[PDB]
From Swiss-Prot:
Domain (NR LBD) ranges: 34-262
Compartmental location: Nucleus
Biological role stated in the UniProt entry: Ligand-activated transcription factor key mediator of energy metabolism in adipose tissues. Receptor that binds peroxisome proliferators such as hypolipidemic drugs and fatty acids. Has a preference for poly-unsaturated fatty acids, such as gamma-linoleic acid and eicosapentanoic acid. Once activated by a ligand, the receptor binds to promoter elements of target genes. Regulates the peroxisomal beta-oxidation pathway of fatty acids. Functions as transcription activator for the acyl-CoA oxidase gene. Decreases expression of NPC1L1 once activated by a ligand.
Tissue-by-tissue expression: Ubiquitous with maximal levels in placenta and skeletal muscle.
Keyword vocabulary terms for this entry: Activator, DNA-binding, Metal-binding, Nucleus, Receptor, Transcription, Transcription regulation, Ubl conjugation, Zinc, Zinc-finger
Keyword Zinc: yes
Assembly notes: Heterodimer with the retinoid X receptor. Interacts (via domain NR LBD) with CRY1 and CRY2 in a ligand-dependent manner.
Broad class of where this protein is predominantly found: nucleus
GN (gene name): PPARD
Origin species: Homo sapiens
The keyword Metal-binding belongs to this UniProt entry's keyword annotation: yes
Biological processes per GO annotation: adipose tissue development; apoptotic process; apoptotic signaling pathway; axon ensheathment; cell differentiation; cell population proliferation; cell-substrate adhesion; cellular response to hypoxia
Sequence similarity: Belongs to the nuclear hormone receptor family. NR1 subfamily.
Any one GO CC term of the record: chromatin
Protein name: Peroxisome proliferator-activated receptor delta
Amino acid sequence: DLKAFSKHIYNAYLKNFNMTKKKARSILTGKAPFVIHDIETLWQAEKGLVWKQLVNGLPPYKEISVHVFYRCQCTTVETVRELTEFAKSIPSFSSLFLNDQVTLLKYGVHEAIFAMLASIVNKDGLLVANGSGFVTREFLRSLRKPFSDIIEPKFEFAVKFNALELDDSDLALFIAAIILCGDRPGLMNVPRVEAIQDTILRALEFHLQANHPDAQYLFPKLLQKMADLRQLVTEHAQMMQRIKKTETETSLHPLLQEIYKDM
Ligand SMILES: CC(C)c1nnc(NS(=O)(=O)c2ccc(CCNC(=O)c3sc4cc(F)ccc4c3Cl)cc2)s1
Ligand SMILES: CCCCCCCCO[C@@H]1O[C@H](CO)[C@@H](O)[C@H](O)[C@H]1O
């Protein structure tokens, strides 16, 4: 029964995401992306590197540390869009009141984004523009503060999370468990959410058995990663709040602006 449930969430993930850990992990290994590590290479990428969201559709250019930020902002907004469509793809989720759905997405989306970030990450950098390019970690560290400080706790996490060696069928269930969380403030029908969450967590355990049989303590380890993700997002909202006051000239997307609102 839970085999059918797991299959459905996997089909909802594959049907909804531009990049599987499978596709990403091949690109970062072999059988090539254009490495962005300085101003010259960013300009080079800006010129002839296939971005889904074009440069003309970005906020008015200000500076380098800000342009990088705006490009990142776009993908976060598009991942919020994939995740909403993935959440709706679960028929149990798309049954709750539209505001209860918005509550789960408002608080769960950033947790999910960071868990999925580990798929396109390695110790030295991350994939960009559907794997067309590869941005270096040192380049991002070389940007001005506060911008150089944003992506660092994400990388620390991503590396640790990648050690668990999860596949796309594990992530579909992991993300589902992240979205459908009863601990979200402003939830109306908490028993119904808590209900669905239980089904997912049951499904996640029995799938981790069939997919990772020799894996010691995987399920409680992922339950801890879920908690760690909650902290990383608390830390993240806090940073973007500082960026909102300090960087008055940088434009924060209202959707993300609303996510960090009462966090
Ligand atoms: C980068 C630093 C100033 C930040 N600004 N916002 C942050 N948010 S975040 O939570 O850490 C976060 C949120 C979502 C992701 C996934 C998407 N990332 C991308 O697609 C990126 S980064 C980058 C740098 C480039 F030159 C060119 C393109 C490019 C692209 Cl594309 C990563 C990090 S980090
Ligand atoms: C508080 C913010 C979190 C809410 C997430 C909203 C983002 C989802 O935006 C989605 O865009 C799609 C196509 O353009 C549509 O088909 C959907 O109806 C829509 O909800």
